[PDB]
Amino acid sequence: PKSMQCKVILLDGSEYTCDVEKRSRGQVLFDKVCEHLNLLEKDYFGLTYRDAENQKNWLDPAKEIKKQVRSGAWHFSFNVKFYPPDPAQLSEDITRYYLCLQLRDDIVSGRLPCSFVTLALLGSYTVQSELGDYDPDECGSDYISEFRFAPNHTKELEDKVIELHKSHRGMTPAEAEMHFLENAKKLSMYGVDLHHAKDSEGVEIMLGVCASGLLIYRDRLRINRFAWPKVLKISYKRNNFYIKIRPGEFEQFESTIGFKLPNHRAAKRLWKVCVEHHTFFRLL
Numbered sequence: 075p076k077s078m079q080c081k082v083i084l085l086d087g088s089e090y091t092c093d094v095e096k097r098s099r100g101q102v103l104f105d106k107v108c109e110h111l112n113l114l115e116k117d118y119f120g121l122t123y124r125d126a127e128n129q130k131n132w133l134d135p136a137k138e139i140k141k142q143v144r145s146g147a148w149h150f151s152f153n154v155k156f157y158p159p160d161p162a163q164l165s166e167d168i169t170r171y172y173l174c175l176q177l178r179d180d181i182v183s184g185r186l187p188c189s190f191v192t193l194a195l196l197g198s199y200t201v202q203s204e205l206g207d208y209d210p211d212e213c214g215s216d217y218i219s220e221f222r223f224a225p226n227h228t229k230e231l232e233d234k235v236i237e238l239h240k241s242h243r244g245m246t247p248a249e250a251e252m253h254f255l256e257n258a259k260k261l262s263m264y265g266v267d268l269h270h271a272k273d274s275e276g277v278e279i280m281l282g283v284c285a286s287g288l289l290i291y292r293d294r295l296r297i298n299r300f301a302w303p304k305v306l307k308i309s310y311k312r313n314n315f316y317i318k319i320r321p322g323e324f325e326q327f328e329s330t331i332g333f334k335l336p337n338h339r340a341a342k343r344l345w346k347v348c349v350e351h352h353t354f355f356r357l358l
């Protein structure tokens with residue numbers, strides 16, 4: 075039985091290596107990673123890989139790994155797939171812990187924009203969780219933390235993290251992680267997966283997929299929001315993605331909004347993440 079080596083980047087930035095039979099479905103690898111991580115609440119997570127176009131794709135647990143990675147290396151990342159709207163309702167601390175690690179990367183990467191004060195508050199909870207109570211021995215007026223807190227670090231941000239860290243004396247890692255999540259979950263881009271698209275008039279927009287529904291960012295003056303209930307059906311054809319929207323009660327007919335994606339694979343990728351989000355958040 076011939077086995078392929080798999081390399082998985084974990085949320086702490088470490089590499090897990092294992093082997094699976096070469097015809098294995100994604101679920102086989104995912105189960106091995108989750109066992110390694112002592113993760114039971116697996117439903118919120120998945121593995122990503124990079125395609126021949128270098129785009130992030132979700133490894134489908136139901137399909138053979140080889141028919142997805144195709145010509146590419148068997149190299150993956152472990153990621154949050156479905157961001158829980160209320161992390162306090164997760165049953166395990168270790169689940170909240172992996173969600174915190176994901177969000178810290180979302181923030182440092184700039185996928186999850188954040189005000190100065192929220193960057194410093196989130197940072198202060200991370201330090202409390204990672205190091206425990208504030209110690210002036212480690213920290214002088216010139217302190218810079220090893221922790222990455224933001225897409226651009228300043229001395230003022232490092233100072234504010236320490237100031238808030240001082241206020242958290244006696245907080246346990248689980249408690250600090252829960253506070254981190256209570257703040258992160260409120261950010262306007264929390265758990266929003268963004269896709270580049272053009273509207274029916276060729277104007278560049280972003281589509282966001284999240285728990286509550288589909289967002290159309292036409293600009294900061296005009297964001298349209300379609301709660302999952304308002305979304306009749308989803309479809310792709312060629313480079314196009316279509317959303318059918320319920321009529322207002324007493325209008326007779328649904329509306330169709332069409333979008334032009336960069337290529338056929340980007341349209342199919344958007345369709346599949348929408349279907350998965352609608353199913354997941356239909357059942358939550």
Ligand SMILES: Cc1cccc(C(=O)N2CCC(C(N)=O)CC2)c1
Binds near residue numbers: 260262284
């Ligand atoms: C489709 C739809 C319907 C209602 C609200 C939104 C919205 O604005 N989101 C989702 C929630 C998110 C958050 N931080 O909870 C802020 C962005 C989207």
